[PDB]
Amino acid sequence: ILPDPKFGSELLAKFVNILMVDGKKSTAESIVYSALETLAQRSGKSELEAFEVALENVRPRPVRRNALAMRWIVEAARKRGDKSMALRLANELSDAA
Amino acid sequence: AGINIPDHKHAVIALTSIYGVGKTRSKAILAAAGIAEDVKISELSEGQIDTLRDEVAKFVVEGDLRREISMSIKRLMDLGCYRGLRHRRGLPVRGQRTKTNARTRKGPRKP
Amino acid sequence: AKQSMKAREVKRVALADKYFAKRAELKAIISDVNASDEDRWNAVLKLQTLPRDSSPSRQRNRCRQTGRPHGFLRKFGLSRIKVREAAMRGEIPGLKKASW
Amino acid sequence: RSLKKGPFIDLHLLKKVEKAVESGDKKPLRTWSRRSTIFPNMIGLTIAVHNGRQHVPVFVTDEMVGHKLGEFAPTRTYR
Amino acid sequence: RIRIRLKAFDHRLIDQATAEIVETAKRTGAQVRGPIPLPTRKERFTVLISPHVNKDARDQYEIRTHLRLVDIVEPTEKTVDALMRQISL
Amino acid sequence: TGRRKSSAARVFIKPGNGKIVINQRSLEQYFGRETARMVVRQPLELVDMVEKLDLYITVKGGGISGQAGAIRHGITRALMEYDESLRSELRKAGFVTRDARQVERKKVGLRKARRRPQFSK
Amino acid sequence: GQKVHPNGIRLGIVKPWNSTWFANTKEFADNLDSDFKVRQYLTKELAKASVSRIVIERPAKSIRVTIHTARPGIVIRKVVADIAGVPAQINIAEVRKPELDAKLVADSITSQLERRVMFRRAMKRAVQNAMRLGAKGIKVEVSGRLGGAEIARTEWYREGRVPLHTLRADIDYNTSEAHTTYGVIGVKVWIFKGEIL
RNA sequence: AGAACCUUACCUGGUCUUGACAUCCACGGAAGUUUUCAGAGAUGAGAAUGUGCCUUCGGGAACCGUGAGACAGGUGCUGCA
RNA sequence: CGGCCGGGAACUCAAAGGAGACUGCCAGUGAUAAACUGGAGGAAGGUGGGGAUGACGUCAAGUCAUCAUGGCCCUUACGACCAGGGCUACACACGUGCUACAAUGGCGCAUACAAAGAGAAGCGACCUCGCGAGAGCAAGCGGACCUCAUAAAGUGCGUCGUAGUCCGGAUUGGAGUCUGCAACUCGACUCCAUGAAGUCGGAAUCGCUAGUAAUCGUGGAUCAGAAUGCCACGGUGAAUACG
């Protein structure tokens, strides 16, 4: 299990792996980079790096809880398009805050 | 004219809306008439549209293409060749398989 | 795979090796297209007088000892069952269990 | 026929057309080589085609001057 | 200059043949260099076993024909004698 | 020298103080996608003497991550021939090189290597 | 139910091929047709000559046919020299152990079943004469119409040790087809000599 | 691991039947080649040419045709021989 | 400033001969036994991975249609030949894939990366013609050099923007190109136009635990030409295995 130490965040590495459908890695890296760009609007309190309010979601081991939460977040993200690389992060922010 | 009035589209994309001119034909017409490809019809002035009208009337128009297709298929069916017989009965003419496929040619799968 | 079928094959290849050179020159003079449309018409005239046989389009190259029209290769000249039996009994160089 | 060479019409069909012009009165023009196309000497002719089991006669004129011989007489049938 | 190619089937067979060739060439002289073993051509093709319905039954057959070659800088009379005791001039 | 999923890689030690040229081209020009540079920098940042010594590397075969792993094995073999204490220090951490995870041979009667075709009743 | 050929899987392992010649594709095909025709001709002309093994070698435009068999004083290359456009020579190798050759014991089994000797007695005599010589493993098998009745059976006898999942095994396997008034009888013979490779 | 014609084992009409394919007998002719006509082709009738290697020279040897007896051919049936 | 040549056998590669991991060692568990867990060394640690390797017998399973064969039958024939047609027919249903139902998407421009295999009654450099399938010319190569041979997803810029829309491609028309005596039933491809259904799939059912599935591309057998089939290889590369 190789992480991505460019941002660290093995959770973000798992997010890249779960958005890496059909194995496409560089496109998923561009996806998460646009995600970081859209998150840098507010950036919270190191919210661009880690997620605090996204853990205690409405659809709940802590690793398995985090995995089910990221599955629900990715599902609710890819459920819609309409400039998906912004609207998916908008749905993520709506489910988080 | 009255046909092909879209909104917020490029010139070559808009020119596909005419029955008889599509992508490559629109590219050829714009290259022959010196019209910009990436510009929109709202920002396009009428001075180039007045040339594009005869430039597209040089080739086949919607009604002329429709009546030519109708005349060709009615000629084939009155001549009564294998192509005309299959066109009258609703079967393909290019040697396709009518066993399980050719459902688009045969019609709805009701029975 | 019959005696009649292998007789057809040997008479077909014999007719091909007989009328090969004239058909080859005819295909050549059909291929060169610079002038002489009447000579092209006389070429297709000679081609139509030539029978439909004696051509690689007619050559089917089936098996030799069995005459099987299916399961043929242009390297061993036999059927699948016969080349498997040959590699089975071991009278041909190579053909071990390919495992990579 | 790659649409650039001369059209393919068989010699025996050609000589039967010649005999039809001479004395054959254009009626019993049986054709087995339906693979041949039509070139403009065959206008207003009654050509029988061996498309299936026997010969069926069709009337070919100048409107069908360029076509395939097997188009006119098919070999498919429905109940 | 003079390229002498040789082919065999077994690895020990082509090794013994190339050893005989290089020993004759060392007996002759002319500063013969060592063997140049080239990668072999793998001729594989799948064959259905029975003449009836079976798609899993397919044997795999391997062809490993060794093709090696040696080089000679200059052809001399002793090299011709060692030849007449594939060629490329 | 090292390899990774059919990607030959040759390394040559040369102190250049920031001189990384691959196939007579810079790394930013030849490679990219903002991931290969980082996964090559991952051994280069922890214990590799990232400055005052560089590597001239050439590749032949492989894709992107295959060539990345190939040049990673090349630079770790360069470190091994450089010294052995740094080899022990790298092996104490999670840097066990020579991971053999190549592609599996296509099977017979299947649509892919480990995918049986679909069958009904 | 469906095993592999011991010699066919151990071509490069213990028992080498019966043909040594390299050629290109057309040359390989013509050479295969030629060697198959001369082998069929030699078998149908000397089937009573106790022929066991036929090995062909072609170094460079020259045929060498070696016949490994027993009782060599039966024949003495004219036929192969007349049917081939390449000069050919023949060699005869009188090998020992005449009761262990698979072709010879198969010919004996077929001759006995055509002479209407009992099948159990024939297989027992074969395995006894092959084990008394000093072998290690002998497996015989007779398939198809055991007794000429309408019900076919595969009767096989085993003795000693006849391994088939050991690749270094010196096992020879042969098939024989006898054409009798009840049809055809197929005999598969296995002979295990030793364990060395 | 491959249907345009062959494939093709099938159907429409024309053919040949010791046969398309392997072998025996007696006779004639080396073999072979160019080419015309009837014809969808299979098929029949012509017009010229070549005439060898050996010669027991009433003939050897491959080859083409004529007549008959054996046979042959069958992807026709029975894997429940 | 092309490994192009001198130069070198350092390195890759090539094919050979060997070696390297065999419970080899320590601790603990386990009836000291067998055996198991953890750890060091080690590229590989518990048959490393994969292929091959198919027991006695079961289905009187398929094949006398590739073939061999007991019997039965045709033998002016079910035997040989010829042309056309069928094998590709179409009220309908089932199976295996492919293309999609787009925005990790389509298209326009520049551009990075291979393995493996094949080739001479062939591959085809290179030029010209053509918007094109391809045509004339033609060195080299039965071959690690010559040819197939420009891999694409990716990267960088731009275009739209959630619609049958610039997604997708069925059908049809006009005109060509290639192999082939011959492209109409009965080939493939291309120029243009038309661009349909399709907007994520019911009861139910299939494959998959690893650089596998998933996604994209390439080569070959077969073959005059004609495969979304089959056989091999490569690019990126998951999540889960509490039981």
From Swiss-Prot, chain A:
Tell me which UniProt keywords the record has, alphabetically.
Ribonucleoprotein, Ribosomal protein, RNA-binding, rRNA-binding, tRNA-binding
Q: Which cysteines are joined by disulfide bonds?
A: none
Does the record's keyword annotation contain Mitochondrion?
A: no
Superkingdom of this protein's organism: Bacteria
GO biological process, alphabetically ordered: cytoplasmic translation; negative regulation of translation; ribosomal small subunit assembly; translation
Any GO molecular function: rRNA binding
- One of the record's GO cellular component terms: cytosolic small ribosomal subunit
Keyword RNA-binding (UniProt): yes
What other remark does the UniProt record contain for this protein? The strain K12 sequence is shown.
Q: What does this protein do?
A: One of the primary rRNA binding proteins, it binds directly to 16S rRNA where it nucleates assembly of the head domain of the 30S subunit. Is located at the subunit interface close to the decoding center, where it has been shown to contact mRNA. Has been shown to contact tRNA in both the P and E sites; it probably blocks exit of the E site tRNA. Protein S7 is also a translational repressor protein; it regulates the expression of the str operon members to different degrees by binding to its mRNA.
Please state which protein family the record places this protein in. Belongs to the universal ribosomal protein uS7 family.
Subunit notes for this chain?
Part of the 30S ribosomal subunit. Contacts proteins S9 and S11. Cross-links to IF3 and the P and E site tRNAs.
Protein known as: Small ribosomal subunit protein uS7
- Report the source organism: Escherichia coli (strain K12)
The primary gene name is rpsG
Region of the whole protein represented: 12 to 128 of 179
From Swiss-Prot, chain C:
Q: What does this protein do?
A: Binds 16S rRNA, required for the assembly of 30S particles and may also be responsible for determining the conformation of the 16S rRNA at the A site.
Note the InterPro entries from the entry: Ribosomal_uS14, Ribosomal_uS14_bac/plastid, Ribosomal_uS14_CS
Tell me the SUPFAM superfamilies matching this sequence: Glucocorticoid receptor-like (DNA-binding domain)
Q: Which organism is it from?
A: Escherichia coli (strain K12)
Instruction: Kindly list the biological process annotations in GO that this record carries.
Output: cytoplasmic translation; ribosomal small subunit assembly; translation
* Gene Ontology terms, MF aspect: rRNA binding; structural constituent of ribosome; tRNA binding
Instruction: Give the CC-aspect GO terms.
Output: cytoplasm; cytosolic small ribosomal subunit; small ribosomal subunit
Q: What is this protein called?
A: Small ribosomal subunit protein uS14
Task: State the UniProt keywords alphabetically.
Answer: Ribonucleoprotein, Ribosomal protein
Its domain of life?
Answer: Bacteria
Query: Which Pfam families is this protein grouped with?
Result: Ribosomal_S14
Q: Entry's PROSITE patterns?
A: RIBOSOMAL_S14
**What PANTHER family is this protein classified in?**
30S RIBOSOMAL PROTEIN S14, SMALL RIBOSOMAL SUBUNIT PROTEIN US14M
- Could you describe the subunit structure of this protein? Part of the 30S ribosomal subunit. Contacts proteins S3 and S10.
Give the family this protein belongs to, as stated in its UniProt record: Belongs to the universal ribosomal protein uS14 family.
Curated annotation (Swiss-Prot), chain D:
Alphabetically sorted, this entry's keywords are: Ribonucleoprotein, Ribosomal protein, RNA-binding, rRNA-binding, tRNA-binding
What superkingdom does the record give? Bacteria
Under Gene3D superfamilies, the record lists:
30s Ribosomal Protein S19, Chain A
Kindly name one Pfam family recorded for this protein: Ribosomal_S19
> Which GO molecular function annotation, any one, does this entry have?
rRNA binding
Q: Which family is annotated?
A: Belongs to the universal ribosomal protein uS19 family.
Relate the protein's function as given in its record.
In the E.coli 70S ribosome in the initiation state it has been modeled to contact the 23S rRNA of the 50S subunit forming part of bridge B1a; this bridge is broken in the model with bound EF-G. The 23S rRNA contact site in bridge B1a is modeled to differ in different ribosomal states, contacting alternately S13 or S19. In the 3.5 angstroms resolved ribosome structures the contacts between L5, S13 and S19 bridge B1b are different, confirming the dynamic nature of this interaction. Bridge B1a is not visible in the crystallized ribosomes due to 23S rRNA disorder. Protein S19 forms a complex with S13 that binds strongly to the 16S ribosomal RNA. Contacts the A site tRNA.
Protein name in UniProt: Small ribosomal subunit protein uS19
The organism that produces this protein has a lineage beginning with: Bacteria, Pseudomonadati, Pseudomonadota, Gammaproteobacteria, Enterobacterales
Q: Which gene encodes it?
A: rpsS
UniProtKB/Swiss-Prot annotation, chain G:
- GO cellular component terms, semicolon-separated: cytoplasm; cytosol; cytosolic small ribosomal subunit
In its keyword annotation, does this UniProt entry include Secreted? Answer: no
Q: Return the similarity comment.
A: Belongs to the universal ribosomal protein uS3 family.
Q: Which species is listed as the source?
A: Escherichia coli (strain K12)
Q: Could you list the residue ranges that cross the membrane?
A: none
Q: Which InterPro entries match?
A: KH_dom (IPR004087), KH_dom-like_a/b (IPR015946), KH_dom_type_2 (IPR004044), KH_sf_prok-type (IPR009019), Ribosomal_S3_C_sf (IPR036419), Ribosomal_uS3_bac-typ (IPR005704), Ribosomal_uS3_C (IPR001351), Ribosomal_uS3_CS (IPR018280)
Q: Which residues form the KH type-2 domain?
A: 38-96
Q: What does this protein do?
A: Binds the lower part of the 30S subunit head. Binds mRNA in the 70S ribosome, positioning it for translation.
Q: Is Signal given among the entry's keywords?
A: no
- SUPFAM superfamilies registered for this protein in UniProt: Prokaryotic type KH domain (KH-domain type II), Ribosomal protein S3 C-terminal domain
> What assembly does the database describe for this protein?
Part of the 30S ribosomal subunit. Forms a tight complex with proteins uS10 and uS14. With proteins uS4 and uS5 encircles the mRNA as it enters the ribosome, which may play a role in mRNA helicase processivity. Some nascent polypeptide chains are able to cross-link to this protein in situ. In collided ribosomes contacts ribosome rescue factor SmrB.
Q: Which GO terms describe its molecular function?
A: mRNA binding; rRNA binding; structural constituent of ribosome
Tell me the protein's name.
Small ribosomal subunit protein uS3
Key words, A-Z: Ribonucleoprotein, Ribosomal protein, RNA-binding, rRNA-binding
Gene3D superfamilies documented for this protein: 3.30.300.20, Ribosomal protein S3, C-terminal domain
Please cite one Gene Ontology biological process associated with this protein.
ribosomal small subunit assembly
